[PDB]
Amino acid sequence: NSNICEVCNKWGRLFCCDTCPRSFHEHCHIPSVEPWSCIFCRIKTIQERCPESQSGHQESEVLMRQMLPEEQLKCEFLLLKVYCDSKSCFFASEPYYNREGSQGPQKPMWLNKVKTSLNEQMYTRVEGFVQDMRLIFHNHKEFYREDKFTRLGIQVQDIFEKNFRNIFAIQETS
């Protein structure tokens, strides 16, 4: 197995996958680490049991799906892919807003709040999860305005959207 956490790339108390060489801190894995197979493995098994699941889909159909166990897993994995990027640190914990010339968002949102909501089964459809994730980056863009720091929200949103299209097999388009 790897000697560093797959998500944050640090050493420490690591739990090892039994079906692949990845390792994880307890609370870096999503769900929190519970023979054991990691979320990467579990996602791969879904694809292998249903190869047609990789044919292209419409985003509108994906968003209306109820959060059954396989969609719950795919959202957990998508959330984990965002935490895998180091720039997720800016969006992980609860933000506060006191900048001259700006007003904070009406509905603040952050990654650890989405993690908790997933863990507590608060989303009934994929749309709920995706709306909250996109809201993180939209709030950031609106608040920081012309500050170059706005770019961090564009960057991490791009990671979210690329992984969304991959994990839920969104039909490729020009």
Give the interface with Cl ion as residue ranges (CB under 5 A). 95, 140
Name the segment binding Zn ion (CB under 5 A); options: 5-13, 46-54, 130-138, 153-161: 5-13
Could you list the beta-strand ranges (E) of the chain: 15-16, 23-24
What one-character-per-residue DSSP string does 78-128 give?
A: HHHHHHTSGGGHHHHS------TT----SS---HHHHHHHHHTT--SBHHH
Of 169, 156, 21, nearest in space to 88 by CA: 156
Q: Smaller CB distance to Zn ion: residue 28 or 118?
A: 28
Cβ at position 139, least distance to Zn ion in Å:
26
Cβ at position 94, least distance to Cl ion in Å:
10
Contact flag: residue 25 with Zn ion (CB under 5 A): yes
Give the per-residue contact string, 34-73, with Zn ion (x = CB under 5 A; - = no): ----x-xx--------------------------------
Contact 15, 29 (CB under 8 A): yes
Contact 28, 4 (CB under 8 A): no
Cβ at position 126, least distance to Cl ion in Å:
24
Contact flag: residue 82 with Zn ion (CB under 5 A): no
Interface residue list for Zn ion (CB under 5 A): 5, 7-8, 17, 20, 22, 25, 28, 38, 40-41
